[PDB]
Symmetry: C3
């Protein structure tokens, strides 16, 4: 069909700056752990040492297959500059079939 | 209740520039295929002809109802500048009831 | 394990400007309703009084636990500048275990 459930996963994480986000995205592509990344600038807020702080970071969504999830989490844990980084996966319900094929081809290998 | 499961879907895709993202978003609204779109600038990375490339694009999330999903995918496939565009749907678990009503009203028609 | 299903929810909403998005994010943190927020600039389009309009807003994703969902929706409904704001939750499938612990600790209290 034009689209189907597929087996894509979307992993999200945030980084201290544009440079680090792009560098890690590139390293993940080199290892065929992701087929593509989309990064964007964000303003964040959270608790830190008893106070609410404002921060500027770069978020990134990583697109890959379910088969690469474990490896992706391990590589992100390896490369992340933060001690306790935000790393979580969102549920993908459907995906354009041709794109799913491209994702699969893009992550074939190591 | 204040919120419930609803029947909203979120479709994500990326475009070569701001102009194209907005133009397509407008065309989707004209056809009542989406109730709203949120677009933002992104930096992307993926494989292309054996090399890892960096790109600048505009991403967009399209908010509509489950009933419009098939039509939305067909219209996006029709208008997309890319040969193999990223088009996938994310799972929505809950939604403010009043907003869900607004979504339904916004996509009533053609 | 390195990651598991967890009990995190992601709530998304849009605001008229950067100032309002950050202010509300801060208020949600003060009440321990969210552990963190990530906000970014967006361009939006929707129907308004029979015409398709273009707008500039700031979107924000709120990260919290399933236990805080009801309270979060109530506080957002309380503080939102829009009469019919977009507020919905996305499904989180997996999450880095250490991060999940941080989320839980971050929302403990009121």
């Amino acid at each position: 069909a034009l689209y189907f459930m597929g087996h894509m996963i979307l992993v999200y994480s945030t980084f201290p700056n544009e440079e680090k986000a792009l560098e890690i995205g590139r390293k993940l592509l080199e290892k065929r752990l992701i087929a593509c990344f989309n990064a964007f600038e964000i303003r964040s807020g959270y608790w830190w040492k008893g106070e609410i702080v404002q921060d500027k970071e770069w978020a990134a969504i990583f697109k890959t297959t379910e088969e690469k999830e474990k490896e992706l989490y391990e590589e992100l844990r390896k490369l992340h500059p933060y001690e306790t980084p935000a790393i979580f996966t969102l549920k993908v319900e459907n995906i354009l079939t041709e794109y799913m094929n491209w994702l699969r081809e893009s992550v074939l290998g190591s």
